[PDB]
């Protein structure tokens, strides 16, 4: 996994790759790793994948309930508080590491959460097995008050560095742009550098190749 967040002059952009691996096998080539906690709060996680999915789903449900209750747009810090308290309650046994980025009436926020409940503020963050490769690019090229275009380019290129230089990271780049004044822009497969090599031959078999003992029709 390669995840990065990047705050820029008017918002924050979070990006991730799409390869999903069980052991050394690529279970899914186009796994979507960016999750909505709210329309303008987005997160991407590492560690135990199932725990990240469950905790983000729980926090999103609770946050939408609270937004309806208070009749206010969710704060990113509210999600941070609830998420880290839940993570702490289990003393790290849920093993969810997250980068949560979003926009709320108080500004644009970028945080990270670790399985044990610790959190950090940041201007640029990285996570996952490709965290170091992406962080190298983020250190080399990040600057104060990036424009939206520069921010997208920088985050995309850090994710590309993780893709090229890490085994557990590959395929396509997902990008989500949260900006202060307007809606979040989710860019599914923003970059698609890993196109599929063509088959040398079509390996379709002639019909009847397989041997069949019985055939039946099932009353569903």
């Amino acid at each position: 996994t390669t995840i990065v967040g990047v705050k820029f002059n008017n918002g924050v952009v979070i990006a991730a790759d799409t390869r999903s691996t069980q052991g050394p096998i690529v279970a899914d080539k186009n796994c979507a790793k960016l999750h909505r906690i709210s329309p303008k709060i987005w997160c991407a996680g590492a560690g135990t994948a199932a725990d990240t999915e469950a905790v983000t789903q729980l926090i999103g449900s609770n946050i939408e309930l609270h937004s309806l209750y208070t009749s206010r747009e969710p704060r990113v810090v509210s999600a941070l508080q609830m998420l880290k308290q839940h993570l702490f309650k289990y003393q790290g046994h849920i093993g969810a590491y997250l980068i949560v980025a979003g926009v709320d009436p108080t500004g644009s926020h970028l945080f990270s959460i670790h399985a044990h409940g610790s959190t950090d503020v940041g201007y640029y963050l990285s996570l996952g097995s490709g965290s170091l490769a992406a962080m190298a690019v983020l250190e080399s090229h990040w600057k104060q008050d990036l424009t939206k275009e520069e921010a997208i380019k920088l985050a995309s290129d850090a994710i590309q560095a993780g893709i090229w230089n890490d085994l557990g990271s590959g395929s396509n780049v997902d990008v989500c742009v949260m900006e202060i004044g307007k809606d979040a822009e989710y860019l599914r497969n923003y970059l698609t550098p890993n196109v599929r090599e063509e088959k040398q031959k079509s390996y379709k078999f002639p019909r009847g190749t397989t041997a069949v003992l019985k055939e039946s029709i099932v009353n569903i």
Binding site: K84, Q85, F88, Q91, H116, G117, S118, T119, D120, L132
Partner: protein, 196 residues
Amino acid sequence: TSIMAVTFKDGVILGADSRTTTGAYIANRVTDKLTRVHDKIWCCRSGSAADTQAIADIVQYHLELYTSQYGTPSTETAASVFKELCYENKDNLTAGIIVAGYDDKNKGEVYTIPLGGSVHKLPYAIAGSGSTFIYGYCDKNFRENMSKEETVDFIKHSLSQAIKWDGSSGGVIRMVVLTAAGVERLIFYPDEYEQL
């Protein structure tokens, strides 16, 4: 980590490094370790980040409730709450905390709560893995009732050596100056404090 609170003539100056390591990797090089638990009470965190942050949030809750129900707490009340939380959960918790605050009657106060969970009032306190390298320096250079600038320079030199010698300490040196005038954030960058 290298955190350091020093009482002085007008109050107390709390300072810390900004590096957070996870193994040899520096997962965050500009983190701010000084935490405002109340208007004139600032704790500082050493040990497990999760434990320290949970303790800090619980203490903020307790002290806000105390302020609303019984009037403003003193530094001693805050450190006592830290004591109860750290001690009654000492098996689970692994947090060592410095609590520094300014009270009009007491002026500047500093309490240190080592990993074991005890309370100690000290004129100055140093904590974190990087403080071991400056126990001699701070002991041999500290003075009672220093001036503000003298205290700032003292903390600057002490944390400069702590950063020099500890691989897990580094980054900018941030300080909070607690005094009757208010609270002042200070920041000193590597090219400044490393050329002392």
